[PDB]
Short mmCIF file of the C-alpha atoms (twelve columns), coordinates in Angstrom:
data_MODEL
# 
_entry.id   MODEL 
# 
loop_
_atom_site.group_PDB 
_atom_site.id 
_atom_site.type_symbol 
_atom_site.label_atom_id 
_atom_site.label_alt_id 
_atom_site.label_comp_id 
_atom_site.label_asym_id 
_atom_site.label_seq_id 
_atom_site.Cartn_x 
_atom_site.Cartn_y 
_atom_site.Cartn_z 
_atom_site.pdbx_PDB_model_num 
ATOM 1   C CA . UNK A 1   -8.984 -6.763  3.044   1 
ATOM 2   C CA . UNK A 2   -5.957 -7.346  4.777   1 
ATOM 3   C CA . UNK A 3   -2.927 -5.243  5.293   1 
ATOM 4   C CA . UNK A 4   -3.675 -1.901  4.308   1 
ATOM 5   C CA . UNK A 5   -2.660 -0.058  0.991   1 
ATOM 6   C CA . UNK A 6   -2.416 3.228   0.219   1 
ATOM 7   C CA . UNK A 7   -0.163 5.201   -2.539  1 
ATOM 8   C CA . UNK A 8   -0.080 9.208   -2.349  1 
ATOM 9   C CA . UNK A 9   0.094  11.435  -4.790  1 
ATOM 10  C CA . UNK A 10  2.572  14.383  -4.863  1 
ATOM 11  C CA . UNK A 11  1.115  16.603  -7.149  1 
ATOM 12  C CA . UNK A 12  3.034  20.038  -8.634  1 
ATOM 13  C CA . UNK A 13  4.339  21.159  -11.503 1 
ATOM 14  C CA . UNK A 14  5.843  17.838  -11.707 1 
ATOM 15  C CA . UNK A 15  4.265  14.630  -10.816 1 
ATOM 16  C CA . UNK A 16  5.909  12.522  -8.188  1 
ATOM 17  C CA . UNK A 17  4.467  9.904   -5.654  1 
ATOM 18  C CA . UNK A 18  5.217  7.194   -2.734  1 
ATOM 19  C CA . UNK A 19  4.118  3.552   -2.929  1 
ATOM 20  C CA . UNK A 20  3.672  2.508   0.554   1 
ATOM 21  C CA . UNK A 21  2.883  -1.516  1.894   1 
ATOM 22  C CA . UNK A 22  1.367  -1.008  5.169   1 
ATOM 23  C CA . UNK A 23  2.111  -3.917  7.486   1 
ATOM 24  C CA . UNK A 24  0.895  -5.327  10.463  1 
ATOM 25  C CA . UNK A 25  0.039  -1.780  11.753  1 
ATOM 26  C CA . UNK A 26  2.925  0.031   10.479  1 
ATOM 27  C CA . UNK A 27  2.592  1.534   7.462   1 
ATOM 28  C CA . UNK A 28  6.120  1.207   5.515   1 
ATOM 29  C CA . UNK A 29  6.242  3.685   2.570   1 
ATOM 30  C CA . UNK A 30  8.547  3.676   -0.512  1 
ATOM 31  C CA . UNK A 31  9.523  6.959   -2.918  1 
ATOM 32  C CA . UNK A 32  10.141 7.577   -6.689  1 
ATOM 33  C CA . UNK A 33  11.758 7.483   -8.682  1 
ATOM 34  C CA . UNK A 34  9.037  4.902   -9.647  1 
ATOM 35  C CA . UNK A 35  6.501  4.694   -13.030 1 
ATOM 36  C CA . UNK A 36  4.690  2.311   -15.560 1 
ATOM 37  C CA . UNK A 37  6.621  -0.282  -16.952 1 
ATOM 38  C CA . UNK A 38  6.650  -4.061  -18.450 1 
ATOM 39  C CA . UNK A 39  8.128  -6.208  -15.649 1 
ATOM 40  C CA . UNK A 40  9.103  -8.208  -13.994 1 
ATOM 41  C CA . UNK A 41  12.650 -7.332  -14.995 1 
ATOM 42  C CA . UNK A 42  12.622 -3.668  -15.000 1 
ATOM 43  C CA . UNK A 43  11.970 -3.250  -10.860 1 
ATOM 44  C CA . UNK A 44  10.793 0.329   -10.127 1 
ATOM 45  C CA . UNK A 45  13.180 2.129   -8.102  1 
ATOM 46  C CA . UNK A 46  11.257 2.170   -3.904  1 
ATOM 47  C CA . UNK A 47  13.376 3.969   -2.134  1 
ATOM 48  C CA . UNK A 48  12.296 2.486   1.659   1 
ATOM 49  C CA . UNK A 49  10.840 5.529   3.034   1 
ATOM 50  C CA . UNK A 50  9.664  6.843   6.783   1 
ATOM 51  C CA . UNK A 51  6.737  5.266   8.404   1 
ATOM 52  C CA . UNK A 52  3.754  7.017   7.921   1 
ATOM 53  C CA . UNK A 53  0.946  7.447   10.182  1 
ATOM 54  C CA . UNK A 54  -2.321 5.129   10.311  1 
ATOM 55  C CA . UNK A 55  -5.241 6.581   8.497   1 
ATOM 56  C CA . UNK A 56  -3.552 9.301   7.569   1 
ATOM 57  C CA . UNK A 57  -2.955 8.404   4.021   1 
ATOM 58  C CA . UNK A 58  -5.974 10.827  3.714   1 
ATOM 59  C CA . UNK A 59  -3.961 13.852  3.454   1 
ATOM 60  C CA . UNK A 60  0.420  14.270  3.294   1 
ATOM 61  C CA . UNK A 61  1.123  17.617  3.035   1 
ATOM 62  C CA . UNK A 62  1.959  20.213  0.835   1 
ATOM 63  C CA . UNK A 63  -0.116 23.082  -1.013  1 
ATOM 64  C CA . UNK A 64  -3.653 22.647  -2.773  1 
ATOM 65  C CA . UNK A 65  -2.622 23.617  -6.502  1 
ATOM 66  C CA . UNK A 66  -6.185 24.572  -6.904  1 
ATOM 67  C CA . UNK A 67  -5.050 28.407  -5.837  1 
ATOM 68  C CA . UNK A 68  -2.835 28.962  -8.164  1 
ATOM 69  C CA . UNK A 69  -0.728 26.326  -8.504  1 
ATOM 70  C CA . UNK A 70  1.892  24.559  -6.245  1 
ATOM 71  C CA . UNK A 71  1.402  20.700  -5.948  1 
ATOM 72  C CA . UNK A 72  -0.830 18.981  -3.162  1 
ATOM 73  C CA . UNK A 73  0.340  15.448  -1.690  1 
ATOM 74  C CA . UNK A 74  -2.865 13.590  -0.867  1 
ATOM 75  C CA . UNK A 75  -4.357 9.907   -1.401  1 
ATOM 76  C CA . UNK A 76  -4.850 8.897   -5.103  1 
ATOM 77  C CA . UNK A 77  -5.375 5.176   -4.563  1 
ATOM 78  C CA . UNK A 78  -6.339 3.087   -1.135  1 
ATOM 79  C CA . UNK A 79  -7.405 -0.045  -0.058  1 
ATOM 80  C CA . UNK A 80  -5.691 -3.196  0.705   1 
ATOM 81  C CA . UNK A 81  -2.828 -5.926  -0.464  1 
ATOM 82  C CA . UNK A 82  -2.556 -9.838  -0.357  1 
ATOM 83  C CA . UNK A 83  0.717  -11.474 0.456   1 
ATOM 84  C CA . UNK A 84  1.930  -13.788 -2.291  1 
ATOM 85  C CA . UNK A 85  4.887  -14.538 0.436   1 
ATOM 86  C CA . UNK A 86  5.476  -13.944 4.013   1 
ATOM 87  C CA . UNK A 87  4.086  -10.022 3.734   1 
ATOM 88  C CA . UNK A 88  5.832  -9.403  7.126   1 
ATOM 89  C CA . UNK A 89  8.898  -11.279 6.776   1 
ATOM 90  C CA . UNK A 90  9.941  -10.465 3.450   1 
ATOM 91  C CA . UNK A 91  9.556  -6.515  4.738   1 
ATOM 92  C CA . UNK A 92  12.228 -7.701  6.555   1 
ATOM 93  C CA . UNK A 93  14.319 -10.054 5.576   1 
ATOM 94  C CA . UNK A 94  14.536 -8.287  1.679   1 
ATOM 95  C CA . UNK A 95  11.693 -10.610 -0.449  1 
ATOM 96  C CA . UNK A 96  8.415  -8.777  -0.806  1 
ATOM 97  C CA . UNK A 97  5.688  -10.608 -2.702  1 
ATOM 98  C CA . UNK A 98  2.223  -9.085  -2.503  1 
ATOM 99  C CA . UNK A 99  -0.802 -7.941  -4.571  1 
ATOM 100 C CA . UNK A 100 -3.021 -4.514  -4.426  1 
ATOM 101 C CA . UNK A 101 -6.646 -4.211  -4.457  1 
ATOM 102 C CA . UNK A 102 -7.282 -0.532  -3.673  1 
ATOM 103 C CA . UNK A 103 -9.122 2.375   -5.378  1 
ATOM 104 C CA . UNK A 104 -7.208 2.592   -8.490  1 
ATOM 105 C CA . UNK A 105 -4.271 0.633   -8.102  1 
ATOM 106 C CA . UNK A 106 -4.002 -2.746  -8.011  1 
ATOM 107 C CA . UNK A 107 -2.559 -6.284  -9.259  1 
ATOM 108 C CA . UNK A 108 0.432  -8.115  -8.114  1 
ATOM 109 C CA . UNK A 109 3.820  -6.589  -7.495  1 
ATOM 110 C CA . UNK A 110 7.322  -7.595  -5.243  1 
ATOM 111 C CA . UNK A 111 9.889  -5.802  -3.341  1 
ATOM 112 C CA . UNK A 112 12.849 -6.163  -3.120  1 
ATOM 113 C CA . UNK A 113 15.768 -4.716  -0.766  1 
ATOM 114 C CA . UNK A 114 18.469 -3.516  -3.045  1 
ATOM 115 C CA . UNK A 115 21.399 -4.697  -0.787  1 
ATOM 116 C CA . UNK A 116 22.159 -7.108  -2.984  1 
ATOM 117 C CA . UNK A 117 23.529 -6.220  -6.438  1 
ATOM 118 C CA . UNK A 118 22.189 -2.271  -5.802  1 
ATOM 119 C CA . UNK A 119 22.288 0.316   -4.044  1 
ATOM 120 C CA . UNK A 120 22.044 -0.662  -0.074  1 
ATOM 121 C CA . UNK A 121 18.405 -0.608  1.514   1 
ATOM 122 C CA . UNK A 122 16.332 0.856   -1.536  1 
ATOM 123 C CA . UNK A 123 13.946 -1.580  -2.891  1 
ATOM 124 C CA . UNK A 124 12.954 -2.932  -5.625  1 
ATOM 125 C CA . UNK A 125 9.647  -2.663  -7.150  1 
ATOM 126 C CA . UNK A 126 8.835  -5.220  -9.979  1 
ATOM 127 C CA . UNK A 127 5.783  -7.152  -11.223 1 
ATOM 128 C CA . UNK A 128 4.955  -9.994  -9.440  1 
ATOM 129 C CA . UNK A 129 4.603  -12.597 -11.789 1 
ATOM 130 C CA . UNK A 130 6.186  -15.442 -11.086 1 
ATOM 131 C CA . UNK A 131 3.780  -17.484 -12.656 1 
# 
């Protein structure tokens, strides 16, 4: 049970989402283009989104598709994430190493800051197994 995890789900006609690390009481976020794969070797594109709000991984935003269709944004897993590295520091200084125990997602994953042979500031979300 330490630093909190939550992913949301943006539901719609097509299915997107935002993995997002909180840490130490800020709770970073990180977009799709993201899915299943093999790893690590094939990091999942985290795009190193806004801070979100405490708590509030309840409920983003959007439209309840249960009308008639449109797409809701809401929690789909939560719970909480181990450091494998410095949890804090790696946020920062570009090596994320951490593992997710939440409602349905879980395991051990790393990010990654994509300034370095990428993009600029994206990051890079790969399985964790270094052992």
């Amino acid at each position: 049970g330490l630093l909190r995890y939550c992913v949301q789900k943006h539901d719609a006609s097509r299915l997107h989402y935002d993995f997002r690390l909180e840490l130490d009481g800020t709770l970073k976020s990180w977009a799709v283009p993201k899915g299943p794969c093999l790893d690590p070797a094939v990091k999942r594109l985290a795009v190193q989104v806004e801070d979100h709000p405490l708590d509030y991984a309840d409920f983003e935003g959007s439209i309840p598709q249960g009308h008639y269709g449109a797409g809701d944004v809401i929690v789909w897993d939560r719970g909480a994430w181990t450091p494998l590295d410095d949890p804090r520091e790696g946020l920062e200084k570009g090596h994320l190493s951490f593992a997710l125990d939440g409602e349905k997602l879980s395991g051990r994953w790393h990010l990654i800051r994509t300034n370095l042979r990428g993009k600029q500031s994206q990051w890079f979300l790969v399985k964790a197994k270094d052992g």
